[PDB]
Symmetry: D2
Subunit: 104 residues, 4 copies
């Protein structure tokens, strides 16, 4: 069973950075062989929220956020938090680096 990544992308300007970060993370995760679920947030709201079970099963959590989100749900997980710009422009490296991220 391929390891699982979960991610949240959140930019409170329109929808573009939220969705670009999500889709680039999804494409790069799959290229590297991982399963991926992404929750997205904008200024209006939240779509496809991570479930408790999804977070439980994940090897890593990647947060590509330009606003504060709830992070208590990720306690005990390795969490790699970056801006949406970095997630969009450095996606390959961010996926790889997330597996060495500190436990939150």
């Amino acid at each position: 069973k391929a390891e699982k990544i979960v991610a949240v992308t959140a930019c409170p300007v329109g929808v573009a950075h939220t969705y670009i970060a999500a889709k680039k993370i999804e494409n790069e995760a799959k290229k590297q062989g991982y399963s991926i679920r992404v929750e997205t947030q904008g200024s209006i709201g939240i779509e496809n929220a991570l479930t408790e079970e999804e977070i439980k099963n994940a090897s890593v959590v990647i947060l590509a956020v330009d606003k504060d989100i709830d992070e208590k749900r990720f306690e005990g997980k390795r969490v790699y938090k970056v801006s949406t710009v970095k997630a969009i422009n450095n996606t390959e490296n961010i996926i790889k680096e997330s597996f060495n991220a500190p436990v939150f």
Copy 2:
């Protein structure tokens, strides 16, 4: 006095096409020597709406829109209506062609 252009940009996805079309139109109008006022319509709302006096004084109206907007206000003006994609990727030509656009 330089001739005046008024424009509306309107895309019902987030804010990016609305603002990219607006800024590209503004930059190209100024490059060609024209005065420009742009009303924008996106997910944050309608901003900087054209006034009746601005429309009265304009030489042309450019509509870069992917949704319906109020158009009765442009009766009697030359109106050049295009998609946001065309306004963004063909900005120089759209400015030039607007002066030959049909009277609405």
Copy 3:
């Protein structure tokens, strides 16, 4: 076995509408119980291109495009062509309507 949908999203402004349409189609196809493969075309290039076998096995082809793409590879399939804006904002209905789309 779930029926299969294939899609191409293609907006020639950056990558935002291409990726937003792709994610909206992916999530909504899955919600309706379908298997889904989306090829994307944007400024970054073409990604996750449909294979000949994927097109062969699909029940329908959804083209969410704001530019012409060669449709020869979809001959003999039902093809539902819509703008990226409509695919992003009307996704549930577009997936349902695609099964009644004309054969190309």
Copy 4:
């Protein structure tokens, strides 16, 4: 004479945040009665670059950037540096705050 503001906007994801922040700053500066010049930096390159004279005459420099830019040209000026997201969503306060920003 109205006091002068100069700004640079620079988000290295396409052109959207660069242009949205530029238009927000331009419109809000004008609303507050200031003269405003904005240089933009995006995937298309640098547009409407500030001149030495414009920087000399400015009361404040606002940098709405999501990457490092060379700041030597702003020495001796009050410089207020914020992200593009904050410039877009908090424009009124950022313009007012810039006049108390530290001299660079």
